[PDB]
Design an enzyme around this catalytic site. Structure first.
Site, short mmCIF file in Angstrom:
data_model
loop_
_atom_site.label_atom_id
_atom_site.label_comp_id
_atom_site.label_asym_id
_atom_site.label_seq_id
_atom_site.Cartn_x
_atom_site.Cartn_y
_atom_site.Cartn_z
N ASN B 375 0.83 -1.19 0.00
CA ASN B 375 0.00 0.00 0.00
C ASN B 375 0.87 1.25 0.00
O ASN B 375 2.10 1.19 -0.15
CB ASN B 375 -0.95 -0.02 1.19
CG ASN B 375 -0.24 0.17 2.51
OD1 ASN B 375 0.73 -0.52 2.81
ND2 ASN B 375 -0.72 1.11 3.32
N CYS B 377 1.52 3.07 2.53
CA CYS B 377 2.34 3.05 3.73
C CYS B 377 3.20 1.80 3.83
O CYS B 377 3.93 1.65 4.82
CB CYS B 377 1.46 3.18 4.98
SG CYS B 377 0.38 4.64 4.98
N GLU B 379 2.60 -1.42 4.39
CA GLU B 379 2.34 -2.39 5.44
C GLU B 379 1.20 -3.35 5.12
O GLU B 379 1.08 -4.38 5.79
CB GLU B 379 2.06 -1.69 6.78
CG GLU B 379 0.61 -1.66 7.24
CD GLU B 379 -0.19 -0.55 6.58
OE1 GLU B 379 0.43 0.38 6.02
OE2 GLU B 379 -1.43 -0.60 6.65
#
Ligand SMILES: Nc1ncnc2c1ncn2[C@@H]1O[C@H](COP(=O)(O)OP(=O)(O)OP(=O)(O)O)[C@@H](O)[C@H]1O
Ligand SMILES: Nc1ncnc2c1ncn2[C@@H]1O[C@H](COP(=O)(O)OP(=O)(O)OP(=O)(O)O)[C@@H](O)[C@H]1O
Ligand SMILES: Cc1cn([C@H]2C[C@H](O)[C@@H](COP(=O)(O)OP(=O)(O)OP(=O)(O)O)O2)c(=O)[nH]c1=O
Ligand SMILES: [Mg+2]
Ligand SMILES: [Mg+2]
Ligand SMILES: [Mn+2]
Ligand SMILES: [Mn+2]
Ligand SMILES: [Mn+2]
Ligand SMILES: [Mn+2]
Lengths: 289, 683, 289, 683
Positions: B375, B377, B379
């Site tokens: 994604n 981020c 994670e």
């Protein structure tokens, strides 16, 4: 023993007039009398002329004749400051404070002013008289340059400093202080080069060079007196400015390794208050733990 | 300057050679005595407040209508009975500036912390007053924190979606590219961060309808996506954030990376599009042996084999691709590519690094799909199936696009309450409710995967805060022992709650029978290795809480075999940007960047010490940059062994270390089983 | 029409050697073969030697003969960059990568090298031939200057850009990229000054100046091909370097307002990765017919 | 240098003070005896050629399968019986470089001019051998020229679309914007120029669901469309060309125009998307009276009235918009906006100017919709209905997106053969066939409008060539008289053919009953005014041809009333850029830019004299820049009175004239009834 430290000092002093916002002077300028504004414009115009010739002619020609890549780099940098920074800053000041017609008129006034033409004639004449491999003609031009840096600018510098010291025209004054800070180191540096040449001479030759330096100083001084009276009588400051230029004449002589010529006098205390990341390749041992 | 701001800036003023941390508390009082109470709208009773908020289109009628007013009042009373006080000025400031509901004119405060918590609890419970009170006790004890979308928008009519992490698969077609742009715009409109996989897209210089040198590559698609994300910027509130992931064996990988170079031209550089690189184990093996690698043209591989390059295992396919004359490839130096990645991360922190085999060797749903990208981020690591968006008036083949549900446990608050099990199960229930109540009508694959996979992300935060307030260094083996035990219990109770939900509802996630949960392989390391603390200090920390043993894990494995598992994915550790302030917690499981952080709001300066920072624990609150990144990698791997998805893992580097050190950290992360590397923040 | 704009672009590009830390290049440098290290050293010395001529003679001589205060200031600034910034930057790169004895030997070799000397002396010859108040001789020197700034440097720049595009010698490559960016604007600016002279000439004189420029380009180009093979055959790059020379020759011609001489070619991707009508108001009755 | 290149350059080498035009002819001979005949691929007979072109995926086999090989042989023999010779080198060069079919590696020539014409004729006839021979005779005589898409791509397997221009209506929604981007990419992939009406999109600083100052305006959509057209660039062969049209009363009209300013920032500047401005008569009236005007926010108007701002008449609703407090508006100076338009056109030739009231005062299909924008060449002016592209899993309301097929009459060849009627009818049949066989599967509104409107564009070329070769000055009243008579004849026979097709097929275009064709209003000026030539020279030029009188027009009006019209739109005069070279014709009805044009191809330079240029007609071939633009406006208005769609009217300006002169020319064009202005090309 000194060029490297002058190189470092010159490059660390680098600045541009655009770093200083000038619109803050608009009101203290508006408030000055017509006489005061006239003297101020003319004073800065006289400075502009001096820096124009110091940048176009004086510094480049001395750079051409002085040996050593580092000495040439310092002199080239100083030349750039004269015409790309100093001379231009005055136009920044003019364009902020004055309408175009007043700006046009003051530049016309420099062309026809007899004292300003005389001082330019004398200084530039000496620059253009330098002969290749002739150290004496070079010395004479370096004396002229020190007198421009450390003496001649000061009839002009007086007035911005005089205002700065009273809390008036402080943004323009900040520019002028930066210019003055540069000229002080320029005068010292060129002074040291002149002393190098002087120190190579016989005692008889040295005696003649001192005569040249003192005769030139007196001739420039007498002209500067008339220039000073012409500009400052209308604002009542001529006598005060005269004391200031004598003070700075002594500093110019000292930059040349000579004794002071004028007696000490009290200067206006107002003017004194005016003063990527590093890259390593990957080893085969960095892939194992 | 306001009084609370002066009291906050008085922290840095040292008295007796010590920071005045306690002054921060006084600031909070001022911030409530001078500002918050003055600008907080008060009502004669809660009935009037709820009527005003519902009528003025602040709240939703549906979730409040499921309860009688007596039950809602009881939930609000339970929230207010805690008498919760923000311990630091920045916590209250961040809540009342970012999350507290304000009037349309943005000058008055309609929601307190207790009001927002009560509303979120009532939304979570979906009509159960006792469950709502349990959620209120969970959030007012600050044991669990719903993500910024859920916490901010739950129960609000004027709101975005409760999910903000979206992963899209882009198929190699103009129709699919246009649909991906449209879906990215629609999801950014909803307020979500969108990640797109560009590995299936054919490289630059490929054929379109058998005309040569026609494709613009993935860089043109990145330009289109960057423009789409700039356009869709939450109605001009936040800058549109998007991520693009490319496999390192895609030929465009250099040009991809060249989009983040400062020297890149305006027609090459993308500014609002984050980039991530997926690195299979084959690339690391090639770089390790210094053998020259090959970057392949995806469309030639698709034509030769009928499958996309990123859809097959490169470890067994690389030699066949190289030896295949009909597969077009370009020679590259993998070590040079690694050095380029390290240099780019030093300059800008990009790209994100995904170790594909590290993700997929523990992935429970490889039968559905292997995790091909992450994604925004870095994670979320889930199986995704690409969609075939055909022409108009033609039925599309809808695949699976990842969208997981975020929520973070506060490790300090959870462990001091000795409530790992209850907090994990309640957070799982809330995440399940938010996933079930999410309905996106413009992202077909996202909606289909939300309905089928039922994937949620339960994260943790305040790890470094908890360790520092307990006299444990983040790099110490005791800290890793605690992380191992705590996250093994979190995984145990998350799996137990997922199986309980599957048993209650009678349904598992789609294609669960092929997962390692169904076959019992997932529990192998749990039925053979005991994860009880090896240090007496950590065991005393876990005192009062039952630590699941190997027999408990065997019982859980049998329970999952009998009843299944409701969620395809349960745990993912998000960065937790601003909610960590409100919870007075350190961000994510990352070590703290600064002991006291200086921020500038408006024309005022503010100072936030790390939670619980004092003279006694000043040394234990070691800054992340001063830490050894190898030990941070060790801790993150210790946590990752109990997290089914990834962990947002930011590298913290000094300006002195070079790209060789960055590459060494990346390779040690790959060696230690790190799934994703988020950022390379240089001090 | 252009000097103030170039003034702005020049001064805003100001930089100093100290800004880039060089020591991290040793990580990559140690992994290059002897031929790669040899070529790099020789290329670097070539650039250094040519740039010194430009700082000591090329820019100052043009500044001397060009009329206009603002042009002289821009030219002074460019001369400063050669002597104070570029020269120190090249020295810094050398001192980082090689020991003192190796530097002295490389400069001895490159100083005796036939192809480097041929081009260096051809350019210097044209600077020495400028005559006071003769705009034709000034134009010829400006052509030489543009050819140095926009063309002759590029057989040298190729190699640092080639490494820079691969992730090798990134610190010195960053420095070289800044230098190259300065030389590009120098070439464009001097090119505009040459076009100004060219446009003041008759049609026959123009044709004669075009023949001069093309003839000079041909001489320099044929020597560049030999220079290129001499340095780059040992590292297998000469074919691609030749494409880069022609591409930059075309840019130099365009700077002088001339048509490209060579057909368009694509450049090595690694090196690439390294690299008003008069407004008149409506007066009414213009809406009626 | 090639021999033909030297012979063509020998034209400018004057002999006895005169250009050597005849040398040009020699060049063609060389170009054929040294290049074309050697580079052509010859087969034993036509059967082997057709088989090789069919199996090697050069030709579609379906259109050739409708004829027995004897019929195809007869058609090819009819094409070759004319012994067509290119009179200029550039005609043959342009055909064999841009339109002749080459091999896959483009090393040899597979199609001659006769082969291409035969294939296009066989495609047009759709199984009719006699009709195929008629088309062959029409094209080999060069009386009619199919557009570049049709001429180049007819009967080819690797072809694109035969439609040149597409016009899209973009509704004010994110779904509609994304669909417009997708359709623009799809149609640029098909090779057609796409025009988008952005007047319905709400301006910058509008509300997206009650959050104000949220919209990016039309500039963000402009950037998205610019990136979409950059990405979809005909597989990298021809740069993707798009057009954006905005009403001058849109609030973003300045920002719109600021996209083309040479000083625009990169975040605003748009470089691959042409811009057009639609000016109602209200704006010209306000500028004339010097009264300050008001630009409007479209979304406020839509909220207040339920209709879009460009969906209704500004001449009657402007005062209601201004006096309505619920409508948001900004004050502008209409004269300053006109001066900005003139300055922008002087600097870059943009925007296109569309005088909306001039278009709609004679528009025959105002009942369906008013013409709100034009195409990329500003000559297509048709009714369009915006589409409501809804969310996924929701049915979309498909509107009408304009699309017409282009074809140009060669005026010199048509009048030399005295075959206005036959050429017009055959061209109408060919354009009807092109419309019928056009089916676009990714643009639903375009497909529906093609099926319903059945709109075609029949243009004309070589107006200036015919006038100069007949000793008529283009600015003379005799030239305007000729244009009046010729284009009245073209309109008469186009209407007759449309009615005959409607009779033979029993169907008219959709909503024909409400059109001015059905009510007989369209024929008013044709049943009361005689358009026979007023000068004896023009009447002699029209000798041997029956010029329709008021009685013939009355009979045609009765015939249309009885049978209807098959085509909603029939005549549109496209620029006809490069296909005018092959036909040895001046571009469109515009005057020639230069008598001899010097064009650089490869490393060589070629000179193309205007067709028929010689010593006796040197001054009749007056250059456009030397001409009075007012008399060119008079000519274009005279032609426009007989053209139902617009004419691509390029303004040819001198550098000496000011923006005031450009504004005066624009206002005179508006006064004279000019519908659209294409370009402001300055010498
Ligand atoms: N640190 C804090 N965090 C949150 N709210 C606070 C804080 N300090 C004060 N408040 C708010 O201001 C009110 C006043 O609190 P104070 O410290 O004056 O005493 P109290 O006994 O808690 O008051 P009260 O009668 O309001 O309960 C609190 O009830 C609360 O609403
Ligand atoms: N201007 C032209 N346009 C088209 N084709 C041409 C042209 N000039 C030559 N050709 C082609 O090249 C061939 C060369 O023949 P050319 O025109 O010299 O006369 P030819 O051999 O007497 O026969 P013919 O004129 O009857 O074809 C022609 O038959 C024709 O196919
Ligand atoms: C989502 C979004 C819309 N817009 C603009 C462009 C569209 O023309 C306009 C309409 O968007 P819509 O898609 O219609 O948004 P909406 O339907 O949710 O809002 P409303 O009910 O008011 O119609 O908003 C932006 O400028 N930026 C954005 O990010
Ligand atoms: Mg496809
Ligand atoms: Mg809407
Ligand atoms: Mn100075
Ligand atoms: Mn000085
Ligand atoms: Mn240099
Ligand atoms: Mn230079």
């Amino acid at each position: 023993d000194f060029t490297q430290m002058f190189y470092n000092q010159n490059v660390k002093q680098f600045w541009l007039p655009e770093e200083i916002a000038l619109n803050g002077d608009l009101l203290t300028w508006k408030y000055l009398g017509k006489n005061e504004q006239d003297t101020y414009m003319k004073v800065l115009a006289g400075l502009t002329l001096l820096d124009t010739e110091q940048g176009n002619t004086g510094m480049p020609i001395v750079a051409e004749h002085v040996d050593g890549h580092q000495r040439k780099a310092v002199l080239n940098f100083m030349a750039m400051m004269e015409n790309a920074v100093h001379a231009k800053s005055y136009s920044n000041i003019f364009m902020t404070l004055a309408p175009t017609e007043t700006i046009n008129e003051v530049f016309e006034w420099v062309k026809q002013n007899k004292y300003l033409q005389k001082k330019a004639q004398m200084i530039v004449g000496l620059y253009k008289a330098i002969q290749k491999d002739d150290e004496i003609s070079l010395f004479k031009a370096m004396v002229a340059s020190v007198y421009l840096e450390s003496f001649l600018f000061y009839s002009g510098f007086y007035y911005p400093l005089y205002f700065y010291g009273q809390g008036k025209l402080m943004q323009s004054g900040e520019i002028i202080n930066l210019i003055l800070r540069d000229e002080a180191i320029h005068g010292v540096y060129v002074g040291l080069l002149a002393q190098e040449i002087y120190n190579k001479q016989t005692e008889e030759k040295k005696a003649e060079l001192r005569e040249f330096a003192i005769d030139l100083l007196n001739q420039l001084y007498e002209n500067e007196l008339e220039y000073t009276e012409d500009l400052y009588d209308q604002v009542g400051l001529s006598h005060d400015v005269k004391k200031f230029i004598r003070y700075n004449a002594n500093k110019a002589l000292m930059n040349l390794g000579f004794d002071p010529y004028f007696e000490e006098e009290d200067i206006n205390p107002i003017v004194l208050n005016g003063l990527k990341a590093t890259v390593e390749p990957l080893k085969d041992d960095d892939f194992y733990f | 300057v306001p009084k609370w701001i002066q009291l906050n800036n008085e922290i840095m003023i040292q008295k007796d050679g010590k920071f005045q941390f306690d002054k921060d508390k006084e600031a909070v009082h001022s911030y409530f005595v001078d500002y918050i109470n003055q600008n907080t709208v008060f009502f004669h009773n809660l009935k009037e407040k709820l009527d005003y908020l519902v009528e003025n289109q602040y709240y939703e009628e549906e979730f409040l209508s499921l309860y009688s007013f007596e039950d809602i009042k009881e939930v609000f009373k339970t929230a207010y009975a805690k008498k919760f006080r923000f311990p630091s000025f920045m916590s209250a400031f961040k809540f009342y500036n970012d999350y507290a509901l304000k009037t349309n004119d943005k000058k008055k405060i309609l929601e307190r912390y207790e009001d927002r918590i009560s509303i979120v609890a009532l939304f979570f419970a979906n009509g159960d007053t006792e469950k709502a009170k349990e959620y209120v006790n969970l959030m007012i004890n600050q044991e669990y924190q719903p993500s910024t979308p859920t916490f901010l928008n739950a129960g609000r009519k004027r709101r975005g979606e409760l999910v903000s992490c979206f992963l899209l698969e882009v198929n190699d077609s103009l129709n699919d590219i246009s649909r991906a742009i449209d879906i990215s715009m629609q999801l950014s409109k909803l307020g979500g961060g969108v990640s797109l996989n560009l590995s299936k897209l054919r490289a630059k210089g490929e054929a379109i309808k058998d005309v040569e040198n026609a494709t613009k590559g993935v860089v043109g698609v990145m330009k289109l996506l960057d423009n789409a994300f700039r356009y869709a910027d939450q109605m001009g509130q936040r800058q549109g954030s998007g991520a693009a992931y490319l496999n390192i064996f895609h030929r465009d990988i250099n040009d991809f990376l060249d989009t983040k170079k400062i020297s890149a031209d305006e027609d090459v550089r993308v500014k609002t599009l984050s980039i991530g690189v997926v690195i299979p184990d084959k690339f690391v093996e090639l770089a390790r042996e210094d053998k020259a690698a090959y970057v392949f043209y995806p469309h030639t591989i698709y034509k030769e084999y009928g499958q996309h390059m990123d859809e097959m295992d490169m470890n067994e396919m690389y030699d066949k691709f190289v030896d295949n004359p009909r597969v077009k490839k370009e020679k590259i130096n993998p070590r040079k590519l690694l050095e380029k990645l390290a240099m780019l991360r030093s300059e800008s922190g990009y790209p994100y690094i995904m170790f594909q085999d590290n993700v997929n060797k523990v992935h429970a749903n490889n039968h559905i799909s292997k995790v091909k990208f992450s994604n925004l981020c870095s994670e979320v690591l889930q199986a995704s199936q690409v969609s075939s968006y055909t022409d108009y008036d033609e039925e599309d083949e809808i695949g699976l696009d990842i969208s997981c549900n975020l929520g973070s446990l506060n490790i300090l608050n959870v462990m001091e309450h000795k409530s790992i099990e209850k907090t994990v199960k309640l957070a799982t229930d809330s995440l399940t409710h938010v996933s079930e109540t999410t309905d996106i009508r413009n992202a077909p694959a996202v909606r289909r995967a939300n309905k089928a996979m039922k994937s949620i992300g339960l994260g943790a935060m305040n790890l470094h805060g908890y360790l520092a307030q307990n006299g444990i260094a983040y790099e110490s083996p005791e800290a890793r022992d605690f992380a191992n035990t705590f996250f093994m219990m979190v995984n145990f109770y998350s799996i137990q709650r997922s199986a309980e939900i599957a048993k209650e509802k009678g349904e598992t996630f789609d294609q669960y029978e092929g997962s390692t949960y169904a076959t019992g392989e997932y529990f192998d390391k749990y039925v053979s290795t005991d994860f009880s603390p090896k240090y007496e200090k950590i065991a005393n920390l876990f005192e009062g809480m039952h630590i699941p043993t190997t027999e408990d894990w065997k019982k859980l494995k049998a329970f999952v075999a009998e009843h299944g598992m409701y969620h395809s994915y349960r745990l993912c550790i998000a960065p937790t940007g601003s909610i960590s302030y409100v919870q007075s917690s350190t961000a994510s499981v990352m070590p703290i960047m600064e002991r006291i952080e200086e921020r500038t709001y408006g024309n005022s300066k503010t100072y936030y010490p790390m939670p619980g920072l004092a003279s006694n624990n000043w040394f234990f609150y070691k800054e992340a940059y001063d830490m050894d990144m190898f030990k941070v990698v060790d801790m993150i791997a210790t946590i990752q062994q109990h997290i089914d998805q990834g962990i947002s893992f930011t590298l913290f580097l000094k300006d002195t270390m070079t790209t060789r050190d960055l590459n060494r950290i990346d390779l040690y992360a790959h060696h230690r089983g790190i799934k994703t590397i988020y950022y390379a923040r240089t001090k």
